[PDB]
Write a protein that binds this ligand. Structure first.
Ligand code: SF4
Ligand code: SF4
Length: 448
C-alpha cells in the first residue's frame, strides 16, 4: 500500500502496430488494446515510480489524464504497488480453497453417470474394477436421487446457491427412466438453483424426450463429426430438437483421426438446424501435439471459430474458456479454470463410486461416505492444483487461465497430474496468441 508504483511483470504485450498494443495479465486477464502514448506510460513504470514522477516525465499530457490512466490500470491489476508479490496473492486463493475443502463449498458440479452402456485411456486399478462391475452399469432412480440429495445437503450447509448436474454416460438416453425421474423429483427444488445438461449422441431422441428436455431447460450437447475414416438419424434428431426450440450444441473432436476431415461445413449444418454452439475438443492423445504442425492446428481452430462468429454460432471448448477468461475473469469465483475435475466436480457412477471425472482415473471414494471422500488424499491432491496446475506454470502467460492437458491424458503419459505436457502447452500458447492478434471486438484505450 505504498506510494511507489510498478508495472506488473505479468502484463503481456502483443503488438498489433506502432499505435496498437494488446495487453493482458497472466493471472487476471483484463485483455485490452492501448495506443502508443498509454503504452509509453505503462513502460515508464517498469522501474518503480511515484505518481509525481510520471507527471513530470510526460507532462505534455495533462496530469489529470495521467492520473486517469494510472488509476484505470491499477484497478485492472496491471499496475501494482512496488513490493507486491502477485503470485503469492494468487496462491492464497488456492490455499484458502484447500483449507475449506471439508465444507464442500468448492463442489460446483455433479457429472451423473446414469449408464455405462452405449446404444448398440484409463490408468488406475479402480477404473478396471468398476468399469466391469455388474452393479455399476445402470443407475437406478432411487440411487440417483439419493446421491444428488447427499451433495445438495452438504453444499447448502456452506450456503451454496447453485449446482450443475450433467447427465453423462456411455449413452445417457439408454437410461431415460432415471433421467426423467431425477428431473421430476427436483422440479420444485428451492434450496438452490439446479442447472442441467445432457451429453448424448442423440440417436435415441424422440419427440417425447425432446419436449421433456425443453420443459426442464436442459441444453443438449450432441456428439457430431464430419464424414471421415448415420447422418439421416442425426438430422432426424436435430429436427425434433429444433422443433421444440431446445438449446443444442455439437461436440466435435479435432484429433489425429479427424484432422484432414475437419472443416467449416459443420457451421453451415449447425445453422440449418438451429444449433447454437460447437465445442471443439482437442486430441487427448499427447502425440497429436508432437506429430502435427502446431500452426496448422491453430488455423483449423481459428478458421472454424471465425466462420462460426460470422454465422452467429458460438465455437467453444476449453481453449475458448481460457480465452474468455483472459477477457473477463470468471475462474476466481468458480474455484477452477477450464477443468472442473480439480476438486470442483463429483463424477458419480451407478453404484455410487466417485471419480474426479469420467475423463480421469482419479478415484475419490463412495457416496456412502461423502465426508471420507472429501478428506481422502486423492481428492485433496486433485483439488490442490485447481488455480495453479503445476510449478511448471508459474512464469507462463496462461497461468491463471489454462488448466493444461486433460488429467486423464497426463495420468496416462506421466503418472502425475502435476506434470504438464510441453507439446500441448506450446499449442495453447500459440492458439491464445493468435486469438488475441485476430480479436475484432477488443476494448481500446486512446489517450485524451
Ligand atoms: S499448463 Fe502449460 S500452457 Fe497452461 S498455464 Fe501451465 S505451462 Fe502454461
Ligand atoms: S479431467 Fe479431462 S475431461 Fe474431465 S473436466 Fe478435466 S479436462 Fe475435461
Amino acid at each position: 500500500n505504498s506510494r511507489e508504483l510498478l508495472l506488473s511483470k505479468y502484463v503481456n504485450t502483443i503488438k498489433k502496430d506502432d499505435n496498437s498494443f494488446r495487453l493482458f495479465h497472466s493471472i487476471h486477464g483484463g485483455l485490452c488494446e492501448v495506443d502508443n502514448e498509454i503504452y509509453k506510460v505503462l513502460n515508464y513504470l517498469k522501474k518503480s515510480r511515484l505518481l509525481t514522477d510520471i507527471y513530470n516525465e510526460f507532462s505534455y499530457i495533462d496530469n489529470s489524464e495521467i492520473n486517469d490512466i494510472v488509476n484505470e490500470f491499477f484497478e485492472k491489476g496491471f499496475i501494482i504497488y512496488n513490493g507486491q508479490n502477485e503470485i503469492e496473492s494468487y496462491r492464497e486463493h488456492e490455499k484458502r480453497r484447500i483449507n475449506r475443502i471439508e465444507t464442500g463449498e468448492q463442489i460446483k458440479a455433479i457429472q451423473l453417470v446414469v449408464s455405462n452402456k452405449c446404444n448398440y485411456i484409463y490408468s488406475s486399478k479402480e477404473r478396471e474394477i468398476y468399469q466391469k462391475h455388474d452393479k455399476n452399469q445402470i443407475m437406478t432412480p432411487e440411487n440417483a436421487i439419493n446421491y444428488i440429495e447427499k451433495v445438495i445437503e452438504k453444499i447448502i450447509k456452506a450456503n451454496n446457491k447453485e449446482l450443475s448436474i450433467q447427465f453423462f454416460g456411455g449413452e445417457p438416453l439408454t437410461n431415460w427412466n432415471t433421467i426423467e425421474r431425477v428431473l421430476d423429483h427436483y422440479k420444485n427444488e428451492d434450496r438452490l438453483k439446479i442447472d442441467y445438461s445432457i451429453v448424448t449422441n442423440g440417436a435415441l431422441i424422440t419427440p417425447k424426450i425432446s419436449e421433456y428436455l425443453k420443459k426442464y431447460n436442459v441444453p443438449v450437447i450432441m456428439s457430431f463429426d464430419s464424414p471421415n475414416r448415420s447422418i439421416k438419424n442425426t438430422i432426424k434428431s436435430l429436427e425434433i430438437l429444433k422443433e421444440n426450440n431446445n438449446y443444442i450444441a455439437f461436440n466435435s473432436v479435432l484429433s489425429r483421426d479427424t484432422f484432414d476431415y475437419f472443416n467449416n461445413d459443420i457451421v453451415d449444418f449447425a445453422q440449418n438446424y438451429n444449433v447454437s454452439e460447437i465445442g471443439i475438443l482437442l486430441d487427448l492423445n499427447p502425440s497429436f501435439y508432437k506429430d502435427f504442425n502446431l500452426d496448422d492446428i491453430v488455423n483449423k481452430v481459428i478458421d472454424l471459430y471465425e466462420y462460426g462468429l460470422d454465422n452467429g454460432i458460438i465455437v467453444t471448448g476449453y481453449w475458448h474458456i481460457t480465452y474468455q477468461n483472459i477477457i473477463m475473469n470468471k475462474s476466481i469465483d468458480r474455484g477452477y479454470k477450464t477443468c472442473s475435475a480439480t476438486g470442483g466436480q463429483l463424477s458419480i457412477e451407478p453404484m455410487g463410486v466417485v471419480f474426479a471425472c469420467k475423463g480421469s482415473s482419479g478415484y475419490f471414494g463412495n457416496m456412502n461416505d461423502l465426508e471420507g471422500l472429501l478428506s481422502c488424499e486423492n481428492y485433496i491432491k486433485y483439488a490442490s492444483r485447481s488455480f495453479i496446475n503445476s510449478n511448471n506454470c508459474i512464469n507462463c502467460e496462461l497461468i491463471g487461465h489454462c488448466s493444461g492437458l486433460c488429467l486423464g491424458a497426463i495420468e496416462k503419459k506421466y503418472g502425475n497430474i502435476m506434470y504438464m505436457d510441453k507439446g500441448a502447452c506450446d499449442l495453447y500458447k500459440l492458439l491464445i496468441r493468435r486469438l488475441i492478434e485476430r480479436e475484432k471486438n477488443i476494448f481500446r484505450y486512446d489517450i485524451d
